[PDB]
Amino acid sequence: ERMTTQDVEAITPQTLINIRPVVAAIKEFFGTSQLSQFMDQNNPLSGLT
Amino acid sequence: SFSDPRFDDVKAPVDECKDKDMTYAAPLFVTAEFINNNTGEIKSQTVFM
Amino acid sequence: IFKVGDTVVYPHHGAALVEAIETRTIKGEQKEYLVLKVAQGDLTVRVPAENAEYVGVRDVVGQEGLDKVFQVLRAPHTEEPTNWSRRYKANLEKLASGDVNKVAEVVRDLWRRDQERGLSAGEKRMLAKARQILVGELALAESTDDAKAETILDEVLAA
């Protein structure tokens, strides 16, 4: 998107890169996911299980 | 272009994270590189990812 | 033209340093690809020697340009109509052009304005951004301190 809308010979990858969807994707995966569960630890066998 | 995925240190120890409810993590530094084909440069920043 | 360690001004990032010249190649010709690095954006930029004036990278402005922008100062009588949005677009186009005298004229126009009225949010951001890059340019033109150039400002900013 901003490869064209921004001006030429003034931009920099600091201006190009927005890290917010990536860090939002990571935070969304470690939370609120089917696969990310609590560590079921009432005993270390259930931890290892 | 991107290059060099490197990690930093962690921002807090484990027990301090678990007490003060901060997530245990470490930052990402990625060496990006922008090239204009029309005139020819490299733009090597170290992006905090 | 250029040598090692030259304090050289790069559009639009201002003054900077060169470290060396890579003799890397394309199509087997090892051109004089100079490496240039800044302290503002904290990055390194490889530059070929040929397109230096094409991109407009440029040696530092001397006391002649310092006296030129001081001659620009204390002569702010200019007319802008009610289309101050067109004024914002106009000096935005200025800031895109990056001429030193024009950047000086616009920051002294905004000094005239907040000296009279006060500006809006993006207007003050415009003033602060163009002011900081202009004063960085001046403070490395004289090769002195940033705050020392800021002391020069208040005695040349409408004094």
Side-chain angles (χ1 to χ4, degrees):
Chain A
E1 192 273 334
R2 69 179 68 187
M3 193 68 75
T4 65
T5 64
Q6 290 293 322
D7 58 353
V8 291
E9 286 91 9
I11 49 96
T12 190
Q14 186 67 41
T15 54
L16 293 175
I17 297 171
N18 204 168
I19 64 172
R20 66 178 177 89
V22 173
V23 66
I26 295 169
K27 192 268 296 295
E28 178 62 31
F29 181 72
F30 279 96
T32 66
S33 176
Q34 181 67 46
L35 273 304
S36 174
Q37 297 178 357
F38 278 171
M39 183 176 177
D40 183 72
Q41 49 176 356
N42 50 3
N43 50 6
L45 181 61
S46 177
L48 190 59
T49 305
Chain B
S1 176
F2 290 101
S3 178
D4 191 75
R6 65 181 297 274
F7 286 92
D8 293 331
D9 294 331
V10 299
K11 59 180 66 63
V14 176
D15 195 2
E16 184 175 0
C17 284
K18 190 178 287 186
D19 193 2
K20 296 180 176 66
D21 299 335
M22 298 174 71
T23 183
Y24 184 75
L28 282 168
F29 286 167
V30 176
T31 305
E33 186 175 2
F34 175 74
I35 295 169
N36 202 166
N37 298 321
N38 290 319
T39 174
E41 291 85 4
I42 72 173
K43 264 68 187 299
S44 296
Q45 292 180 355
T46 304
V47 176
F48 173 73
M49 189 61 71
Chain C
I1 302 170
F2 297 102
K3 292 179 287 295
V4 61
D6 293 338
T7 62
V8 62
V9 178
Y10 181 71
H12 298 171
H13 304 285
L17 295 176
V18 291
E19 183 177 0
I21 297 169
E22 287 88 2
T23 62
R24 52 99 61 215
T25 181
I26 182 167
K27 199 179 170 64
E29 298 92 6
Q30 287 79 19
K31 286 87 170 181
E32 296 293 323
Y33 294 102
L34 63 94
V35 62
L36 189 147
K37 65 181 295 297
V38 304
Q40 185 175 2
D42 293 330
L43 80 159
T44 64
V45 173
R46 187 262 295 165
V47 182
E50 295 86 4
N51 51 5
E53 68 272 15
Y54 290 168
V55 71
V57 70
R58 186 180 65 248
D59 291 331
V60 76
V61 179
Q63 288 83 15
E64 67 278 14
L66 184 272
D67 295 331
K68 183 177 178 181
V69 301
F70 283 173
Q71 190 174 3
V72 171
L73 284 163
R74 294 186 66 190
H77 186 273
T78 183
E79 173 63 31
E80 174 66 29
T82 63
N83 294 325
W84 75 272
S85 178
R86 184 66 177 172
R87 185 179 65 243
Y88 176 69
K89 188 180 288 184
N91 59 10
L92 180 61
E93 184 178 2
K94 186 278 316 182
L95 198 279
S97 66
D99 179 76
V100 177
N101 305 116
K102 291 177 69 67
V103 168
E105 200 276 332
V106 166
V107 300
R108 66 189 291 276
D109 195 3
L110 298 175
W111 179 254
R112 177 68 173 84
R113 185 62 63 87
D114 63 359
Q115 188 176 3
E116 179 67 28
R117 289 184 178 94
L119 272 61
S120 73
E123 287 291 327
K124 287 178 183 178
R125 288 180 58 193
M126 184 71 198
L127 171 59
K129 184 177 180 181
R131 179 176 180 270
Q132 285 179 355
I133 58 95
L134 191 274
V135 175
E137 190 271 334
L138 289 177
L140 295 175
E142 191 181 1
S143 296
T144 182
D145 284 331
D146 195 2
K148 189 261 184 293
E150 291 172 352
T151 57
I152 299 298
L153 291 179
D154 190 75
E155 56 88 18
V156 301
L157 267 61

